[PDB]
Structure 1
Amino acid sequence: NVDEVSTILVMSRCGELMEDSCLRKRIIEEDDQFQNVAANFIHLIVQAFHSYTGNDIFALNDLIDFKWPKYVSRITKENIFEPLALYKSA
């Protein structure tokens, strides 16, 4: 359902999103803090594509990788602690 799909993607994609090369290069140009950031992007993707994908795991995993580099570059020194301004910028 909608409660088990998001929980599976969190415990399966958090170990590869916070240690990516794009996120590590953005904090030096502009571990508990990076966990909530990657978990917020996964929850925002499922809630915004629950009707386009349905309940498939492959349909939601491709949309995360397609929007991960575009979501990291839109994070500055102020969007790290304020999740409200980060959703409006992207």
Structure 2
Amino acid sequence: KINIKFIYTMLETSFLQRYSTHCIPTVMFPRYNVDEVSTILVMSRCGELMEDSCLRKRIIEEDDQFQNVAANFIHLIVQAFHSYTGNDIFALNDLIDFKWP
């Protein structure tokens, strides 16, 4: 009554190509391009950036406008460091975290 079904995730192509005659169904996940990377970064990070404590203390020390501020920051980070990071979501997330305050 119980039938186990295995779902594997693999990283490298050569490890997968070792087992090609087994004819296992495979779904490939190609790397994102820079526009998809920028859209993913905006939709994943602008909410956390626009309710950050540094921005909320800065606006009383000196919502859609804050959204445009965070999105313009993300786009500037992408255009400054896309050659350095490649299409790497994690590295660009780390750069955004280092440079936002």
| TM superposition shift of 1:2 | 1.2
Q: 1:4 aligns with which of 29, 32, 36?
A: 36
- Number of aligned positions between the proteins: 69
Q: TM-score when scaled to structure 1?
A: 0.75
Query: In 1, Cα distance between the equivalents of 2:57 and 2:89?
Result: 28
The one-letter amino acid of 2:82's match is H
CA-based RMSD: 0.5
Structure 2 residue matching 1:55: 3-state secondary structure? coil
What whole-Å deviation, never above 9, does each CA across 1:36-72 have from its counterpart, x for those lacking one?
0000000000010011000011110000000011xxx
Of structures 1 and 2, the larger Rg is shown by 2
Query: In 2, Cα distance between the equivalents of 1:3 and 1:20?
Result: 25
Q: Which runs of 5+ in 1 are unaligned?
A: 70-90
Q: Share of identical aligned residues, percent?
A: 100
How is 1:11-22 mapped onto 2 (pairs within 5 angstroms)? 11-22=43-54
Q: Which runs of 5+ in 2 are unaligned?
A: 1-32
How is 1:1-90 mapped onto 2 (pairs within 5 angstroms)? 1-69=33-101
Write 1 or 2 for the structure with the bigger share of helix.
1
Q: TM-score when scaled to structure 2?
A: 0.67
Query: In 2, Cα distance between the equivalents of 1:3 and 1:18?
Result: 21
